[PDB]
Amino acid sequence: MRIVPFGAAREVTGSAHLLLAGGRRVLLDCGMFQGKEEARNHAPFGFDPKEVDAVLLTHAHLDHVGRLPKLFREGYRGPVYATRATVLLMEIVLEDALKVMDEPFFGPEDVEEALGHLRPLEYGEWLRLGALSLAFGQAGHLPGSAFVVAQGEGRTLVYSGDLGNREKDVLPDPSLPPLADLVLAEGTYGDRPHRPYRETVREFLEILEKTLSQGGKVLIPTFAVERAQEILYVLYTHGHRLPRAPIYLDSPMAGRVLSLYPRLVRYFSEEVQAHFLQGKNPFRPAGLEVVEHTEASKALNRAPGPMVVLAGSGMLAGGRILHHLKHGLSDPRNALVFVGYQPQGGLGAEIIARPPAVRILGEEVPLRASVHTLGGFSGHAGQDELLDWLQGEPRVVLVHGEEEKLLALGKLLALRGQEVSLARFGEGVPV
Ligand SMILES: [Zn+2]
Ligand SMILES: [Zn+2]
């Protein structure tokens, strides 16, 4: 068989990998490009959508799944397999991008068309494409996230998909992959491990007990998919020693995603499933609110008292979070907490640098609130974890991640006796 990198090549967005084997052609993920690499969603996949036999989707994030509708707009009518959890989130994931997105490739008819071909495939459930044999394995990066195990023609291939951070408590641990002739694996964080989870939560709680006791605000830029609810989970557990204060989840989609969590209980960790059994939703702490429109959202900019805000655009420069950042942040009683590493070159990194003042929404805002950064609350497996997962696997082709980082992981794998390479766009790899 041969697998062909059509997406996350020396870059993190665009995940799309074509598998040519068993006299068949199956697409592994079909996501969009993001940020600066936008526009390329307008270009075409170096392959023919109409010649695809079937597509398997690992998790529902926008990369990995954002171009799928484009694949249908361009002909494809075969099935698209994913787990229920991925199927359900995906509708929210797409519908949203369809709206927010400007000069949008693909459109509404495309989304239903694409959505109409989703067929449920669960962990350890084998799909057969004539001589081809595929199964999903537990990845623990999002509810319903999987890695692909592909067997056929005496060989076995494993595409990692995004691998989760096994220290956190919400999702279940990623499973080790089976011994395979070749592994297509992600390298987001191939250059470093994350700061231990326990210490991060322990610190999170200090920043909260402080800011809140002094009547301050705790702004938390976060992603609306798994990230926000996970904070909420941290806030429910532990919410017995934290000062009473409203918890505004100022993001409709984090809302929609959250609403969906109870239908997905089987997709979470044992700890989490235990709470659900005991008739409790651990993703709704003390006084959670979920704001719906901007009037209410801006009223928060002026309201005082102790408060905790979770707002859209995790990597800043985007959502309601900026208005929250504009007012407040100029006040020392507050505290900004990043629950994801910020990309350098973008605001945030610019804020971490502690410049006396920052530019937000065309204004010059005095930076006086305390700023804290908590990688550790990361959703991807870190270097040390990527290493253990890859363990004893000959041949590894690194995809999904900035060149330098991908390489850093590569170096270590290489120094260990593993054959390593960095997938190139279009250049298929064998087996
Ligand atoms: Zn992901
Ligand atoms: Zn990804």
Side-chain angles (χ1 to χ4, degrees), residues 31-32 37 43 67 84 108-109 119 150 152-153 168 174 181 230 259 265 281 314-315 359 375 380 383 390:
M32 61 173 86
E37 302 309 343
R67 278 188 301 171
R84 271 76 172 188
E109 65 285 349
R119 297 192 80 218
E153 304 170 3
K168 320 206 290 183
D181 297 302
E230 177 171 53
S259 309
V265 49
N281 173 338
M315 276 170 314
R359 173 156 282 282
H380 282 93
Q383 174 186 301
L390 260 16

PDB file of all heavy atoms in Angstrom, residues 31-32 37 43 67 84 108-109 119 150 152-153 168 174 181 230 259 265 281 314-315 359 375 380 383 390:
ATOM      1  N   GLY A  31      -9.245  17.861   6.287  1.00  0.00           N
ATOM      2  CA  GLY A  31      -9.402  19.167   6.911  1.00  0.00           C
ATOM      3  C   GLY A  31      -8.938  20.389   6.153  1.00  0.00           C
ATOM      4  O   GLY A  31      -8.321  20.262   5.111  1.00  0.00           O
ATOM      5  N   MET A  32      -9.221  21.575   6.689  1.00  0.00           N
ATOM      6  CA  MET A  32      -8.841  22.796   6.025  1.00  0.00           C
ATOM      7  C   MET A  32      -7.542  23.370   6.524  1.00  0.00           C
ATOM      8  O   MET A  32      -6.995  22.920   7.525  1.00  0.00           O
ATOM      9  CB  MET A  32      -9.972  23.834   6.103  1.00  0.00           C
ATOM     10  CG  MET A  32     -10.436  24.315   7.486  1.00  0.00           C
ATOM     11  SD  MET A  32     -11.673  25.708   7.337  1.00  0.00           S
ATOM     12  CE  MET A  32     -13.034  24.804   7.168  1.00  0.00           C
ATOM     13  N   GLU A  37      -2.026  30.146   5.968  1.00  0.00           N
ATOM     14  CA  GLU A  37      -2.192  29.147   4.919  1.00  0.00           C
ATOM     15  C   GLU A  37      -3.635  29.018   4.419  1.00  0.00           C
ATOM     16  O   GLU A  37      -3.994  28.024   3.788  1.00  0.00           O
ATOM     17  CB  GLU A  37      -1.667  27.781   5.379  1.00  0.00           C
ATOM     18  CG  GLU A  37      -0.200  27.810   5.775  1.00  0.00           C
ATOM     19  CD  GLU A  37       0.687  28.436   4.708  1.00  0.00           C
ATOM     20  OE1 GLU A  37       0.231  28.553   3.544  1.00  0.00           O
ATOM     21  OE2 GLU A  37       1.838  28.803   5.038  1.00  0.00           O
ATOM     22  N   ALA A  43      -7.541  26.404  -3.588  1.00  0.00           N
ATOM     23  CA  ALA A  43      -6.767  25.624  -4.553  1.00  0.00           C
ATOM     24  C   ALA A  43      -7.383  24.222  -4.614  1.00  0.00           C
ATOM     25  O   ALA A  43      -8.475  24.002  -4.097  1.00  0.00           O
ATOM     26  CB  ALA A  43      -5.318  25.531  -4.091  1.00  0.00           C
ATOM     27  N   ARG A  67     -12.353  20.593   4.969  1.00  0.00           N
ATOM     28  CA  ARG A  67     -12.450  20.617   3.503  1.00  0.00           C
ATOM     29  C   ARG A  67     -13.404  19.540   3.011  1.00  0.00           C
ATOM     30  O   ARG A  67     -13.781  19.536   1.843  1.00  0.00           O
ATOM     31  CB  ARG A  67     -11.070  20.444   2.821  1.00  0.00           C
ATOM     32  CG  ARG A  67     -10.264  21.753   2.748  1.00  0.00           C
ATOM     33  CD  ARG A  67      -8.988  21.651   1.915  1.00  0.00           C
ATOM     34  NE  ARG A  67      -8.082  20.630   2.423  1.00  0.00           N
ATOM     35  CZ  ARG A  67      -6.985  20.208   1.802  1.00  0.00           C
ATOM     36  NH1 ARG A  67      -6.643  20.725   0.626  1.00  0.00           N
ATOM     37  NH2 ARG A  67      -6.238  19.253   2.360  1.00  0.00           N
ATOM     38  N   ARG A  84     -19.578   8.332  16.405  1.00  0.00           N
ATOM     39  CA  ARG A  84     -20.757   9.180  16.623  1.00  0.00           C
ATOM     40  C   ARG A  84     -20.355  10.549  17.127  1.00  0.00           C
ATOM     41  O   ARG A  84     -20.788  11.575  16.594  1.00  0.00           O
ATOM     42  CB  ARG A  84     -21.718   8.597  17.672  1.00  0.00           C
ATOM     43  CG  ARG A  84     -22.778   7.664  17.166  1.00  0.00           C
ATOM     44  CD  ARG A  84     -22.162   6.321  16.854  1.00  0.00           C
ATOM     45  NE  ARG A  84     -23.148   5.292  16.538  1.00  0.00           N
ATOM     46  CZ  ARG A  84     -22.818   4.015  16.381  1.00  0.00           C
ATOM     47  NH1 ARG A  84     -21.546   3.660  16.527  1.00  0.00           N
ATOM     48  NH2 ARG A  84     -23.732   3.095  16.087  1.00  0.00           N
ATOM     49  N   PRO A 108     -23.564  25.872   1.903  1.00  0.00           N
ATOM     50  CA  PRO A 108     -24.599  25.097   2.591  1.00  0.00           C
ATOM     51  C   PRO A 108     -25.028  23.772   1.952  1.00  0.00           C
ATOM     52  O   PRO A 108     -25.125  22.753   2.638  1.00  0.00           O
ATOM     53  CB  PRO A 108     -25.744  26.099   2.716  1.00  0.00           C
ATOM     54  CG  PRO A 108     -25.545  26.986   1.558  1.00  0.00           C
ATOM     55  CD  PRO A 108     -24.066  27.216   1.584  1.00  0.00           C
ATOM     56  N   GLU A 109     -25.296  23.765   0.655  1.00  0.00           N
ATOM     57  CA  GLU A 109     -25.716  22.521   0.026  1.00  0.00           C
ATOM     58  C   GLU A 109     -24.611  21.490   0.205  1.00  0.00           C
ATOM     59  O   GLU A 109     -24.887  20.305   0.420  1.00  0.00           O
ATOM     60  CB  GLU A 109     -26.020  22.719  -1.466  1.00  0.00           C
ATOM     61  CG  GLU A 109     -24.815  23.094  -2.307  1.00  0.00           C
ATOM     62  CD  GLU A 109     -24.382  24.547  -2.109  1.00  0.00           C
ATOM     63  OE1 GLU A 109     -25.145  25.320  -1.474  1.00  0.00           O
ATOM     64  OE2 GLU A 109     -23.287  24.914  -2.605  1.00  0.00           O
ATOM     65  N   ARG A 119     -21.331   7.762   8.185  1.00  0.00           N
ATOM     66  CA  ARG A 119     -21.801   6.480   8.687  1.00  0.00           C
ATOM     67  C   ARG A 119     -20.917   6.194   9.895  1.00  0.00           C
ATOM     68  O   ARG A 119     -19.700   6.307   9.825  1.00  0.00           O
ATOM     69  CB  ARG A 119     -21.640   5.373   7.649  1.00  0.00           C
ATOM     70  CG  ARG A 119     -22.455   5.552   6.374  1.00  0.00           C
ATOM     71  CD  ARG A 119     -22.436   4.260   5.556  1.00  0.00           C
ATOM     72  NE  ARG A 119     -23.387   3.261   6.064  1.00  0.00           N
ATOM     73  CZ  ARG A 119     -23.170   1.942   6.104  1.00  0.00           C
ATOM     74  NH1 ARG A 119     -22.015   1.427   5.675  1.00  0.00           N
ATOM     75  NH2 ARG A 119     -24.125   1.129   6.555  1.00  0.00           N
ATOM     76  N   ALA A 150      -4.622   0.618   9.523  1.00  0.00           N
ATOM     77  CA  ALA A 150      -4.936   0.073   8.206  1.00  0.00           C
ATOM     78  C   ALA A 150      -4.091  -1.144   7.883  1.00  0.00           C
ATOM     79  O   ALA A 150      -2.852  -1.076   7.912  1.00  0.00           O
ATOM     80  CB  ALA A 150      -4.732   1.128   7.144  1.00  0.00           C
ATOM     81  N   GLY A 152      -3.502  -4.592   5.126  1.00  0.00           N
ATOM     82  CA  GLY A 152      -3.782  -5.085   3.792  1.00  0.00           C
ATOM     83  C   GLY A 152      -2.518  -5.338   2.997  1.00  0.00           C
ATOM     84  O   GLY A 152      -1.556  -4.559   3.055  1.00  0.00           O
ATOM     85  N   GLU A 153      -2.522  -6.432   2.238  1.00  0.00           N
ATOM     86  CA  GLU A 153      -1.367  -6.789   1.431  1.00  0.00           C
ATOM     87  C   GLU A 153      -0.226  -7.061   2.386  1.00  0.00           C
ATOM     88  O   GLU A 153       0.832  -6.430   2.307  1.00  0.00           O
ATOM     89  CB  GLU A 153      -0.990  -5.643   0.498  1.00  0.00           C
ATOM     90  CG  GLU A 153      -2.131  -5.198  -0.389  1.00  0.00           C
ATOM     91  CD  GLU A 153      -1.813  -3.917  -1.126  1.00  0.00           C
ATOM     92  OE1 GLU A 153      -0.677  -3.416  -0.987  1.00  0.00           O
ATOM     93  OE2 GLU A 153      -2.697  -3.408  -1.843  1.00  0.00           O
ATOM     94  N   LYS A 168      -4.044  14.812  31.535  1.00  0.00           N
ATOM     95  CA  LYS A 168      -5.317  15.430  31.888  1.00  0.00           C
ATOM     96  C   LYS A 168      -6.367  14.364  32.209  1.00  0.00           C
ATOM     97  O   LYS A 168      -6.178  13.196  31.877  1.00  0.00           O
ATOM     98  CB  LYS A 168      -5.759  16.338  30.746  1.00  0.00           C
ATOM     99  CG  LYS A 168      -4.580  17.099  30.155  1.00  0.00           C
ATOM    100  CD  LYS A 168      -5.002  18.399  29.510  1.00  0.00           C
ATOM    101  CE  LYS A 168      -5.793  18.213  28.243  1.00  0.00           C
ATOM    102  NZ  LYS A 168      -6.093  19.538  27.649  1.00  0.00           N
ATOM    103  N   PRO A 174      -4.788   7.709  25.414  1.00  0.00           N
ATOM    104  CA  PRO A 174      -4.601   7.285  24.030  1.00  0.00           C
ATOM    105  C   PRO A 174      -4.066   5.866  24.149  1.00  0.00           C
ATOM    106  O   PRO A 174      -3.320   5.567  25.092  1.00  0.00           O
ATOM    107  CB  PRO A 174      -3.525   8.229  23.522  1.00  0.00           C
ATOM    108  CG  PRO A 174      -3.641   9.413  24.396  1.00  0.00           C
ATOM    109  CD  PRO A 174      -3.879   8.814  25.745  1.00  0.00           C
ATOM    110  N   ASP A 181       4.219  -1.612  10.004  1.00  0.00           N
ATOM    111  CA  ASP A 181       5.305  -1.410   9.062  1.00  0.00           C
ATOM    112  C   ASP A 181       5.569   0.062   8.870  1.00  0.00           C
ATOM    113  O   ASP A 181       6.695   0.446   8.579  1.00  0.00           O
ATOM    114  CB  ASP A 181       4.978  -2.093   7.739  1.00  0.00           C
ATOM    115  CG  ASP A 181       4.854  -3.589   7.900  1.00  0.00           C
ATOM    116  OD1 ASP A 181       5.850  -4.208   8.359  1.00  0.00           O
ATOM    117  OD2 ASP A 181       3.773  -4.144   7.592  1.00  0.00           O
ATOM    118  N   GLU A 230     -13.245  21.607  29.336  1.00  0.00           N
ATOM    119  CA  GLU A 230     -12.264  20.991  30.230  1.00  0.00           C
ATOM    120  C   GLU A 230     -11.936  21.933  31.371  1.00  0.00           C
ATOM    121  O   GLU A 230     -11.616  21.491  32.466  1.00  0.00           O
ATOM    122  CB  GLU A 230     -10.986  20.595  29.488  1.00  0.00           C
ATOM    123  CG  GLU A 230      -9.916  20.022  30.418  1.00  0.00           C
ATOM    124  CD  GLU A 230      -8.725  19.429  29.688  1.00  0.00           C
ATOM    125  OE1 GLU A 230      -8.132  20.133  28.841  1.00  0.00           O
ATOM    126  OE2 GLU A 230      -8.385  18.257  29.973  1.00  0.00           O
ATOM    127  N   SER A 259     -23.638  21.616  25.371  1.00  0.00           N
ATOM    128  CA  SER A 259     -24.965  21.027  25.436  1.00  0.00           C
ATOM    129  C   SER A 259     -24.894  19.586  25.002  1.00  0.00           C
ATOM    130  O   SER A 259     -25.582  18.713  25.530  1.00  0.00           O
ATOM    131  CB  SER A 259     -25.947  21.751  24.516  1.00  0.00           C
ATOM    132  OG  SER A 259     -25.959  23.156  24.707  1.00  0.00           O
ATOM    133  N   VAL A 265     -21.330  10.929  26.895  1.00  0.00           N
ATOM    134  CA  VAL A 265     -20.639  10.368  28.057  1.00  0.00           C
ATOM    135  C   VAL A 265     -19.737   9.142  27.826  1.00  0.00           C
ATOM    136  O   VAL A 265     -18.666   9.052  28.404  1.00  0.00           O
ATOM    137  CB  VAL A 265     -21.639  10.109  29.234  1.00  0.00           C
ATOM    138  CG1 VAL A 265     -22.855   9.364  28.752  1.00  0.00           C
ATOM    139  CG2 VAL A 265     -20.965   9.339  30.334  1.00  0.00           C
ATOM    140  N   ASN A 281     -23.592  16.210  35.970  1.00  0.00           N
ATOM    141  CA  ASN A 281     -22.903  16.629  34.746  1.00  0.00           C
ATOM    142  C   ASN A 281     -21.700  17.401  35.277  1.00  0.00           C
ATOM    143  O   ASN A 281     -21.841  18.540  35.737  1.00  0.00           O
ATOM    144  CB  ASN A 281     -23.780  17.564  33.914  1.00  0.00           C
ATOM    145  CG  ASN A 281     -23.039  18.139  32.723  1.00  0.00           C
ATOM    146  OD1 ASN A 281     -21.814  18.191  32.722  1.00  0.00           O
ATOM    147  ND2 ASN A 281     -23.771  18.584  31.709  1.00  0.00           N
ATOM    148  N   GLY A 314      -9.204  31.320  21.074  1.00  0.00           N
ATOM    149  CA  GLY A 314      -8.170  30.862  21.980  1.00  0.00           C
ATOM    150  C   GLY A 314      -6.793  31.440  21.728  1.00  0.00           C
ATOM    151  O   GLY A 314      -6.028  31.646  22.672  1.00  0.00           O
ATOM    152  N   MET A 315      -6.463  31.678  20.459  1.00  0.00           N
ATOM    153  CA  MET A 315      -5.176  32.262  20.110  1.00  0.00           C
ATOM    154  C   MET A 315      -5.351  33.768  19.888  1.00  0.00           C
ATOM    155  O   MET A 315      -4.651  34.397  19.103  1.00  0.00           O
ATOM    156  CB  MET A 315      -4.569  31.541  18.887  1.00  0.00           C
ATOM    157  CG  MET A 315      -3.817  30.264  19.313  1.00  0.00           C
ATOM    158  SD  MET A 315      -3.280  29.140  18.019  1.00  0.00           S
ATOM    159  CE  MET A 315      -4.807  29.056  17.009  1.00  0.00           C
ATOM    160  N   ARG A 359      -1.671  46.976  21.802  1.00  0.00           N
ATOM    161  CA  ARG A 359      -2.669  47.449  20.864  1.00  0.00           C
ATOM    162  C   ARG A 359      -3.740  46.395  20.685  1.00  0.00           C
ATOM    163  O   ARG A 359      -3.460  45.280  20.241  1.00  0.00           O
ATOM    164  CB  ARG A 359      -2.019  47.783  19.512  1.00  0.00           C
ATOM    165  CG  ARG A 359      -3.008  48.137  18.400  1.00  0.00           C
ATOM    166  CD  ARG A 359      -2.358  48.996  17.328  1.00  0.00           C
ATOM    167  NE  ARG A 359      -2.233  50.384  17.764  1.00  0.00           N
ATOM    168  CZ  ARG A 359      -3.234  51.260  17.767  1.00  0.00           C
ATOM    169  NH1 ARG A 359      -4.434  50.899  17.330  1.00  0.00           N
ATOM    170  NH2 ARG A 359      -3.034  52.503  18.188  1.00  0.00           N
ATOM    171  N   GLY A 375       0.611  26.165  29.580  1.00  0.00           N
ATOM    172  CA  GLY A 375       0.631  25.113  28.584  1.00  0.00           C
ATOM    173  C   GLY A 375       0.457  24.027  29.615  1.00  0.00           C
ATOM    174  O   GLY A 375       0.549  24.327  30.815  1.00  0.00           O
ATOM    175  N   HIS A 380      -2.579  18.218  22.864  1.00  0.00           N
ATOM    176  CA  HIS A 380      -1.737  17.266  22.121  1.00  0.00           C
ATOM    177  C   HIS A 380      -0.729  16.573  22.975  1.00  0.00           C
ATOM    178  O   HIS A 380      -0.244  17.142  23.926  1.00  0.00           O
ATOM    179  CB  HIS A 380      -0.931  17.932  21.023  1.00  0.00           C
ATOM    180  CG  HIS A 380      -1.706  18.243  19.788  1.00  0.00           C
ATOM    181  ND1 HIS A 380      -2.305  19.464  19.576  1.00  0.00           N
ATOM    182  CD2 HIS A 380      -1.914  17.521  18.664  1.00  0.00           C
ATOM    183  CE1 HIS A 380      -2.843  19.488  18.368  1.00  0.00           C
ATOM    184  NE2 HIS A 380      -2.618  18.319  17.794  1.00  0.00           N
ATOM    185  N   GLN A 383       6.252  15.989  23.492  1.00  0.00           N
ATOM    186  CA  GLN A 383       7.398  15.226  23.017  1.00  0.00           C
ATOM    187  C   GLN A 383       7.677  13.918  23.725  1.00  0.00           C
ATOM    188  O   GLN A 383       7.907  12.880  23.098  1.00  0.00           O
ATOM    189  CB  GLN A 383       8.666  16.059  23.064  1.00  0.00           C
ATOM    190  CG  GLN A 383       9.876  15.235  22.709  1.00  0.00           C
ATOM    191  CD  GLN A 383      11.132  16.004  22.880  1.00  0.00           C
ATOM    192  OE1 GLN A 383      11.318  17.055  22.262  1.00  0.00           O
ATOM    193  NE2 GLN A 383      12.013  15.501  23.734  1.00  0.00           N
ATOM    194  N   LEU A 390       5.427   6.129  19.803  1.00  0.00           N
ATOM    195  CA  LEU A 390       6.193   5.673  18.644  1.00  0.00           C
ATOM    196  C   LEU A 390       7.102   4.482  18.990  1.00  0.00           C
ATOM    197  O   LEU A 390       7.447   3.668  18.138  1.00  0.00           O
ATOM    198  CB  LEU A 390       7.018   6.844  18.128  1.00  0.00           C
ATOM    199  CG  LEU A 390       6.504   7.627  16.922  1.00  0.00           C
ATOM    200  CD1 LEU A 390       5.062   7.334  16.666  1.00  0.00           C
ATOM    201  CD2 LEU A 390       6.751   9.104  17.148  1.00  0.00           C
TER     202      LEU A 390
END
